Amino acid sequence: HRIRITLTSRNVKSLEKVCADLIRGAKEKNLKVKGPVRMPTKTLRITTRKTPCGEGSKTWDRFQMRIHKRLIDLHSPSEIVKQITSISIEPGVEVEVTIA
Amino acid sequence: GRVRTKTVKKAARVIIEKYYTRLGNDFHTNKRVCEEIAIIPSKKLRNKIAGYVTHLMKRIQRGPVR
């Protein structure tokens, strides 16, 4: 009943589009839904020397990967959850479904 | 150093010469005017254009400009 779907994505625009589409689908079906919360962004930062060898001035790179996680709470039968989640999904967003 | 570049100055000149009627001495009014008229993707550049537009409008209303 109290279903909870977790969406992790690398692109902010795609993730916001997916969450907006899901909540609009919930609005169309007239289901009680919690607001889209935003977990703090995870920035995997790696710093490496530009030069393959050790010569030259000490110059370092800054390669960072940003991951955003948003979760939505809904009150609906699991069949409704599967129906809603099976459609309108961007390939770049990882989806997790939790019953509890 | 706060110097307007060629893009800002040239765009401001042509905008004023094309919409001299719709522009005035109020920075905020023509800021929205130039937003509606010309497609400037960056708002900072938009403010730069609007600022130079107002300065040129003051110059025009006071006297000639080359």
Binding site: T47, S57, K58, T59, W60 | -
Partner: protein, 142 residues
């Protein structure tokens, strides 16, 4: 009856002070302890100064409880120094005559502007090839 609850946040380098104002006597305390004993106690006047300038008459009608989190000791005490004044100004502007709000703001600003507006200064990022933001390691000629 009426709930004159006023929330206000004052910011420092990193510390933040959320002061809550309601109806009550002239009791002022932060983190559940009074202002007179706040280590480092050397800068006690930096916390009593908002009370001193405006007088206990203004603070008699309002009780303030504040929560402090983040930053260092000097950051927190300056955060609460700003937040106490901001909370009183917000309370006066929202529930009593604004002439009192205008006069206290003028007095606070003419004394020190930091009472109201937060300083936007932050720590600068460090860069490679040096020990600090601007500092660079020792150059080695020959």
């Amino acid at each position: 009856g009426p709930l004159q609850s006023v929330q206000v946040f004052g910011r420092k380098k990193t510390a933040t002070a959320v002061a809550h104002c309601k109806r009550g006597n002239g009791l002022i305390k932060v983190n559940g302890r009074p202002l007179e004993m706040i280590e480092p106690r050397t800068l006690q006047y930096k916390l009593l100064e908002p009370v001193l300038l405006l007088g206990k008459e203004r603070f008699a009608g309002v009780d303030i409880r504040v929560r402090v989190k983040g930053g260092g000791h000097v950051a927190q005490i300056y955060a609460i120094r700003q937040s106490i004044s901001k909370a009183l100004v917000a309370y006066y502007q929202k529930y009593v005559d604004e002439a009192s709000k205008k006069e206290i703001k003028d007095i606070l600003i003419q004394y020190d502007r930091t009472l109201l507006v937060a300083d936007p200064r932050r720590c600068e990022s460090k860069k490679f090839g040096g020990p600090g933001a601007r500092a660079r390691y020792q150059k080695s000629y020959r």
